[PDB]
Enzyme design. Structure first.
Site, PDB file in Angstrom:
ATOM      1  N   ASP A 189       0.865  -1.166   0.000  1.00 29.41           N
ATOM      2  CA  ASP A 189       0.000   0.000   0.000  1.00 29.41           C
ATOM      3  C   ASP A 189       0.904   1.219   0.000  1.00 29.41           C
ATOM      4  O   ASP A 189       1.662   1.430   0.949  1.00 29.41           O
ATOM      5  CB  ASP A 189      -0.883   0.033   1.247  1.00 29.41           C
ATOM      6  CG  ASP A 189      -2.093  -0.871   1.135  1.00 29.41           C
ATOM      7  OD1 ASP A 189      -2.626  -1.045   0.016  1.00 29.41           O
ATOM      8  OD2 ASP A 189      -2.521  -1.395   2.180  1.00 29.41           O
ATOM      9  N   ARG A 246      -6.976  -5.199 -13.457  1.00 30.99           N
ATOM     10  CA  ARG A 246      -5.531  -5.032 -13.320  1.00 30.99           C
ATOM     11  C   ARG A 246      -4.856  -6.362 -12.952  1.00 30.99           C
ATOM     12  O   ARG A 246      -5.366  -7.120 -12.121  1.00 30.99           O
ATOM     13  CB  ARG A 246      -5.212  -3.981 -12.250  1.00 30.99           C
ATOM     14  CG  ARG A 246      -5.864  -2.631 -12.496  1.00 30.99           C
ATOM     15  CD  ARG A 246      -5.571  -1.645 -11.379  1.00 30.99           C
ATOM     16  NE  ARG A 246      -6.242  -1.983 -10.123  1.00 30.99           N
ATOM     17  CZ  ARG A 246      -6.052  -1.340  -8.975  1.00 30.99           C
ATOM     18  NH1 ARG A 246      -5.190  -0.327  -8.902  1.00 30.99           N
ATOM     19  NH2 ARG A 246      -6.707  -1.716  -7.890  1.00 30.99           N
TER      20      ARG A 246
END
Length: 136
Positions: free
Chosen positions: A35, A82
């Site tokens: 992240d 994705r």
């Protein structure tokens, strides 16, 4: 067992996303297990350290001689279409490099796509210990 496959860089988009030519077709790839602060965050816009993480990923893929993608054991694409993978630039995993520099946190992991989880948690612990960027 996991294995590496060749790809060609098209364009870096953000710290956690890069566009590549995989098997003769243009695709957007989302880096597995990390992240990063974002420059194009839906609600927050440009977060702190976002430009930094974005520049790091860009420099790493643009200056590489060989880019390789390594899919995990589970699904290979997310709901946005994705590809989900570990990206390598000249043998070095981009996912791990970001975590090691304190420019990313290990995301809330979920099997079966968690093969390198322990490896990344260890790098994050080191980055915290050294008080780098995000942890400064």
């Amino acid at each position: 067992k996991l294995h590496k496959e060749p790809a060609t860089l098209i364009k870096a988009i953000d710290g956690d996303t890069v566009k590549l030519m995989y098997k003769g077709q243009p695709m957007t790839f989302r880096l597995l297990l990390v992240d990063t602060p974002e420059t194009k965050h839906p609600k927050k816009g440009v977060e702190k350290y976002g430009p930094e993480a974005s520049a790091f990923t860009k420099k790493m893929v643009e200056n590489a001689k060989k880019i390789e993608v390594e899919f995990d054991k589970g699904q290979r694409t997310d709901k946005y279409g994705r590809g989900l993978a570990y990206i390598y630039a000249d043998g070095k995993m981009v996912n791990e490099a970001l975590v090691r520099q304190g420019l990313a946190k290990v995301a809330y992991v979920a099997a079966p796509n968690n093969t390198h989880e322990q490896h990344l948690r260890k790098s994050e612990a080191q980055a915290k210990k050294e008080k780098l960027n995000i942890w400064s």
